[PDB]
Symmetry: D2
Subunit: 258 residues, 4 copies
């Protein structure tokens, strides 16, 4: 029996990177369907077609827009007959250094909108639908190693990921009465279009810039490792796990220097 057999999932930010890998893995693990919610429509549609349109749909959705998220969740539940897992994974990272001394406030606003407002909207709207359906559920936010430690730059992003932890803890306490679990996964070293904003483009960039700060050697980091943690948390394998951040980061000593 596959661990997500028959389950309906949403993956926000599923057009690329960790979200795409997670959508793919959820289908491999028996999901009835995965809805990819993203702003990249051509790319999202192509990912859905690649996974297979009988088990994956793309919906255009800005996670920070509550009406768009509500509409996307309603469509998901009506189309596929439920909503068992929400993976609130969409995020952004600025290319500017974002040290606190030279913090660009408009760029801070952009990061906080997607990474904190989007998380709050997705957790709220998933929770409402899960409470309505009465079948419990599993809500997962994609935080990051910077959710529990400071960094030498990317200060807005660090603040946003700490805020996600606060959301997860609070939501877990508030929604547990309805058998809804809320957790986060925290990656670090997966090269994606997002990490390219801070110069991490290739597996070699990961080795040169990130791995000196990571304990676990001989295990190259991948998007699929993060997807595995999300699938564990989304499944009944984690039936009694809530309020928790699960890092998939090789043991981060401290965040890399600038």
């Amino acid at each position: 029996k596959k661990k997500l057999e028959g389950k309906v999932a949403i993956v926000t930010g599923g057009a690329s990177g960790i979200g795409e890998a997670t959508a793919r893995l959820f289908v491999k693990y028996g999901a009835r369907a995965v809805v990819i919610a993203d702003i990249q429509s051509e790319l999202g549609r192509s990912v859905a077609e690649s996974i297979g349109k009988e088990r994956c749909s793309f919906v255009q959705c800005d996670v920070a827009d509550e009406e768009q998220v509500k509409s996307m969740i309603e469509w998901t539940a009506t189309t596929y007959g439920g909503l068992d897992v929400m993976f609130s994974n969409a995020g952004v990272l600025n290319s500017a250094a974002q040290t606190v001394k030279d913090l660009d406030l408009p760029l801070f606003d952009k990061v906080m909108r997607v990474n904190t407002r989007g998380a709050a909207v997705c957790v709220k709207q998933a929770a409402r639908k899960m409470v309505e359906l009465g079948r419990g559920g599993s809500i997962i936010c994609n935080a990051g190693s910077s959710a529990v430690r400071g960094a030498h730059g990317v200060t807005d992003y660090v603040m946003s990921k700490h805020a996600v932890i606060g959301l997860v803890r609070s939501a877990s306490m508030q929604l547990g009465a309805h058998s809804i679990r809320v957790n986060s996964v925290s990656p670090m070293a997966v090269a994606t279009p997002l990490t390219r904003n801070q110069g991490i483009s290739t597996p070699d960039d990961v080795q040169k810039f990130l791995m000196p700060f990571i304990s676990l050697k001989g295990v190259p980091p991948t998007a699929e490792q993060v997807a595995e943690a999300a699938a564990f948390l989304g499944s009944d394998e984690a039936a009694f796990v809530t309020g928790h951040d699960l890092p998939v980061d090789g043991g981060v000593l401290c965040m890399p220097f600038l």
Copy 2:
């Protein structure tokens, strides 16, 4: 020698509550000038007058407005010839329950703006001035017990205070090269106009609703206790303390239901 002798401080949100108590205590501990930065102008002027105009000045300032904060810091440093302590203390708490299932998003936006954008602005702008002056400095944010734990409501506020911790940690790492310390204080049980938004108006409300969740008994909680922690962190008593959250909360078991 008094622990803040000769120091110049800014207290944002200093017109009321913990900020007012902290401005008062900083002067008692020898601060040469304390600037109260607040949006309550009438009240802030009256508080500065009560503390004494020779030691305390009021500047109208929305902490989330970077130009206003920059102007207020420039005025402080030009008028008094320094800036040793920034206490970024302003905050807001909505009267709505703010459960995540029924979260009011515009009210979330307000809380995040004051409590996270205001913190970021004040830390940035204080840091710039402290780096320019070359004398080190101490920056303190007012977080709260909800900065390190979840709550059963006030979800926006919890998120905002967690974000403050991330700011403090990051800023401490980035500004330590210039001998600038960054820390937070985390209160819980002081009845103020802010806490009135969630039904905590009197010391008796604190006893009935909050104290069951607090370990330390027989010590009534006060604004002055929080001010003492801020004065410790602002002073050379804490010369090698940075990146830290200092809770003044009697040992919180969990947030109230």
Copy 3:
């Protein structure tokens, strides 16, 4: 059939004669483990559990986890008999029946708890690490901590100290052994009624509901030993290939530890 997420792995479960350890040994075999060695001081019970799992895939070895020579011998036997050592679940523990408040702390009873729960952990992590480094195939070491590993309690002070010490061991070992592709993590239960929890009045699932569940957020999901076993199997497997230095709580979201 389940996913054979532990296909071919050789595991040791200390404290595997009972409770969470027994459930974990059983689940590891269900998930395709080559073998599980149950290392325990309860010989009659341990032998019976091994026979119940199946002697072709499970062996019992008499072993006091705080005795370094016994642990070393048990690991050597495991590796020689089954050709490897891929997972160590350092799960043995003890809990006193005495309240163990700090004001009335019984020091000899503190010593007993610290011996099994901290010395035993250190011995098992050391000796598993040595064998894993020797074999050159990486590995996964898991300690059974508890919800009290990351928070204070109103009694059981020795036990709380012991579980905090386990977290320090896990963090340190993860940092030191990562160079050899060895992962070190903990699982932290709370609400499984076992002979150990009976020492503090938690004997039945109803005791769990009455005394523990008021302090736990997640409702409608009765707590079981098997839930903890699932977390250990996740951490022991390649599903957690890049997870190290971490405590994974299986506790329904603990608000705070229950009052005395």
Copy 4:
């Protein structure tokens, strides 16, 4: 009024290093008396004489021996009329690397005995006397930066300091009903005879081997900084602070390799 005016303190491990500095500072801050409880008798007597025999006494005491600790506390209370602050500061660090792969178990036992058994004994016995006297009190353990993070060696020591945090958290919850506070201080970079066991003897050693891992620059680390944090926690400045670890470590990025 000085912050420890009239208070009676015990500093375990007060014959050397941070404990000595803390005993000295407590007297400077007005303590009625400080009892140095240590196993190094000649050294402890020399420290007490230097601080001043009218305000400081030495008592021979192995912190892991419950009868000796009880006797020392009884002597303190009989001699000086109370017990307001217990600083459970004694600790040891092996010279061996103590990696987990090559952990020496008898040396692990030594570290765990002083650093965990001694902490438990001192917190228990101070708590008993404080409950008896009915005046509240402040109990402080000396933990360390390794109390909240892993290290690349000294594994026994890391375990011991994590256990201290568990003790402090638990004791704070259990003793708050009697207005007794329990906290820790966590140093990192004070060169002492203890740190000499891992090659840290001089200010230059600190700069070369420890400071790369510490955010705060331009502020040389000292024993007196740790003493200041202990004095804050021991005093009414921290009247509503309990269950907390207060790091005096310049912001530790991670433990040194």
